């Protein structure tokens, strides 16, 4: 899985960025059981005052979290994955979930590469 | 609905950047009905000369419009949505179309969360 | 299609720029047919340390192409899409495929905008 996460600068530490990309990382590996370092977190940092919600313009302390994710896995087990994200960055940002937005979407594992290698192959 | 939106740093102004996601925001709300702030702009800024259409390098001039969309929407509605897109972008970033391009990816409600709630639960 | 290839900075030169796009773009125009100018590379660079793999900080030689492609397109044409990606990107940013993760998303053509047109329209 590859996790989008678009944050403002100077908003994340360099710390509580471990914090959260730890966060994302632990409650993937344990929901879904995928080994820890098959699951990558990708900061993408713009400066403050970026995001719009409405057409209004607002401060630094907005996290989007975009999950890419192969598919076969459940509308409740990816509800828990959200949920799950949701809480651990709101506690590892020290940020409140009505900051956080959580949007996965799902690709055959056919069309995704890791470490080089594909995930499923034709075979 | 997220509109991750490419752009050059140094090619809209702190104030047509507000011009264009009022732009996208009001076609969402007015076509689709979604309320005002459920739709968010992100704009992504990187450095002018990062954009190469055919394998050449292009200047600052390029708007990605990569909108995040729950599915039930209609080709036709969309069909809408990117052109209106496309158009009051135009404008508000005083910018010709054939330098916008817009791709909607959908994605089941069920996995979008919102101000850290979802939109539709399990329940 | 629209190559979005995340990378750090001061890691690929703005000639290792050009030679990777050229790798995405001349792979894809010569496997699946587009014209090489319907083939944008659009490059998002990040500070270095700013991508966890199982949780823990890498330096700055991470790759991530996400491609954004029309459907229609086989499991069998985009794996070796993906192979050709990954090994051309191999020599053009001379990094090694373990670095390079490779993911295409599928979206309608009916919804997917170049230069202004749609690709597919409803007519
Ligand atoms: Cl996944
Ligand atoms: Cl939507
Ligand atoms: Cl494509």
Do not use: C
């Not at 678009?6 to 994302?24: C, E, F, G, M, N």
Request: hydrophobic share 40%.
């Amino acid at each position: 899985p590859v996790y989008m996460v678009y944050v403002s600068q100077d908003r994340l530490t360099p710390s509580a960025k471990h914090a959260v990309a730890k966060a994302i990382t632990d409650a993937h590996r344990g929901l879904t059981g995928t080994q820890h370092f098959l699951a990558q977190v990708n900061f993408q940092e713009q400066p403050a005052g970026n995001v719009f919600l409405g057409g209004v313009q607002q401060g630094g302390d907005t996290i989007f979290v975009h999950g890419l994710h192969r598919e076969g896995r459940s509308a409740d087990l990816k509800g828990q994955l959200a949920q799950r994200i949701v809480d651990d960055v709101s506690v590892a940002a020290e940020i409140d979930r009505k900051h956080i937005w959580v949007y996965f979407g799902e690709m055959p594992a056919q069309q995704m590469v890791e470490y080089g290698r594909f995930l499923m192959e034709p075979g």
